[PDB]
Design a protein around this ligand. Structure first.
Ligand code: HEM
Ligand SMILES: COc1ccc2[nH]c3c(c2c1)CCNC3
Length: 393
């Protein structure tokens, strides 16, 4: 039976919401032959997939990412190893490490603001988010900001490899060249940190011990690259989406201005409404069936986080932005950080960092007005506005 609606239609990337509605209603487990994978659109099926790491495993991430990551990433691990190494990464963004980091992130934020405050406008995507996001990631890791701009360039190249389907011969080579340059820059710093242990995540990874057993330097590089990629991408997107959605709903923007504590809920609702990480793949380990769609071992399923997060079975009026949602007619925990074993280790830090930035932008940019009246969004795997310019006094 031929199907005519395709994730890879040009219309989908422009506006995927009609596709989410169609797929959830008429094809919740939808086959795409161009990448030999099934797309899963409903909240309850995505949740089930992500909660069942034994049936739907993370082995698909060994060729979609490992070629550029140089070694095993966290998502490829399991058992005590995954648990202990995930805890090590969390350590770098909790406790005293978090206390130390946040003032630095405040400095990053105000320095960017100060560069733009006299121009009376700023592009939350291109002026703020893309700069802050990589700087924050480098501060978290302990990489000094001198070669910051080249770090951005390479990051973009590796990201493209991981977030893209059916890359051509020349795109693959550039992504790998970016991976090598990043490897060539970062390895000496790991070697230096090996002797000069600092209070950063790189040092944590060097100090880690699996029973008097350290992890190879190339293992630390991949995990460091895993953190750089993981933390940078979603930050610019979410910040842009947050202020866009608030300014498009002036009542809610004012509520946030009058009650700063509502900022957390606005970020959460932004993550639900405009999920910046859109797709999460898994590999099927054994015959399985959702609705009446049969899956075989070896098949690939791709969870559609944005679709799930707008499922009317999980949220009332799911396609409306409302920072005042709560479970106290229908509300659920959003899947924007995933769920189960591989739930985003950086979830709490992300909410803290985004609230810090939002509060400073709201403090320092007075009488914010929207200038980008209508956004253009790009990306199907990770996804955000091209530009989001605001004006201010
Ligand atoms: C708004 C910001 C972010 C969002 C929306 C986001 C989204 C996600 C999602 C959806 C997953 C699950 C992927 C899967 O199940 O395969 C994930 C995992 C992960 N995220 Fe994030 N993330 C964010 C920020 C960060 C930050 C700041 C870091 C590092 C500091 C980070 C590091 C990770 C890691 C290491 C994993 C893998 C966890 C595991 O395998 O156990 N993320 N993230
Ligand atoms: C750069 O492109 C990607 C591709 C897959 C990804 N998965 C996760 C992130 C990410 C970024 C960021 C946060 N952690 C989960």
């Amino acid at each position: 039976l031929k199907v005519y609606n395709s994730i890879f239609d040009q219309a989908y990337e422009i506006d995927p919401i009609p596709y989410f509605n169609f797929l959830r209603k008429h094809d919740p487990v939808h086959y795409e032959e161009s990448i030999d994978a099934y797309f899963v659109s409903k909240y309850k099926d995505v949740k089930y997939i992500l909660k069942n790491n034994d049936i739907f495993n993370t082995k698909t991430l060994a060729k979609r990412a490992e070629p550029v990551m140089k070694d095993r990433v966290l998502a490829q691990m399991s058992g005590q190893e995954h648990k202990s190494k995930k805890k090590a990464i969390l350590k770098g963004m909790t406790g005293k490490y978090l206390e130390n980091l946040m003032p630095i992130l405040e400095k990053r934020t105000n320095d960017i603001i100060n560069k733009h405050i006299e121009k009376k406008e700023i592009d939350i995507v291109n002026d703020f988010g893309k700069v802050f996001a990589v700087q924050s990631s480098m501060d978290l890791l302990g990489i000094n900001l001198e070669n910051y701009e080249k770090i951005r360039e390479w990051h973009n190249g590796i990201a493209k490899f991981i977030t893209s389907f059916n890359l051509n011969d020349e795109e693959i080579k550039y992504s790998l060249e970016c991976s090598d340059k990043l490897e060539n820059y970062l390895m000496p710093l790991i070697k230096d940190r090996k002797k000069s242990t600092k209070d950063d995540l790189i040092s944590i990874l060097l100090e880690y011990k699996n029973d008097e057993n350290s992890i190879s330097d190339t293992e630390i590089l991949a995990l460091s690259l895993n953190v750089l990629l993981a933390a940078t991408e979603p930050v610019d997107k979410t910040l842009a989406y947050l202020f866009y959605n608030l300014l498009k709903n002036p009542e809610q923007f004012e509520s946030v201005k009058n009650n700063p504590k509502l900022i957390k809920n606005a970020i959460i609702e932004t993550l639900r409404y405009n999920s910046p990480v859109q797709l999460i793949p898994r590999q099927v380990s054994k015959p399985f069936i959702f609705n009446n769609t049969e899956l075989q071992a070896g098949d690939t399923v791709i969870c559609m986080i944005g679709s799930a997060n707008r499922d009317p079975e999980a949220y009332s009026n799911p396609d409306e932005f409302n920072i005042h949602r709560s479970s106290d007619t229908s509300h659920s925990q959003n899947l924007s950080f995933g769920t189960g074993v591989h739930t985003c280790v950086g979830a709490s830090f992300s909410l803290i960092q985004l609230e810090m930035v939002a509060i400073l932008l709201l403090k320092r940019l007075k009488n914010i007005k929207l200038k980008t009246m209508e956004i253009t969004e790009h990306g199907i795997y990770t996804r955000g506005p091209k530009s989001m310019v605001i004006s201010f006094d």
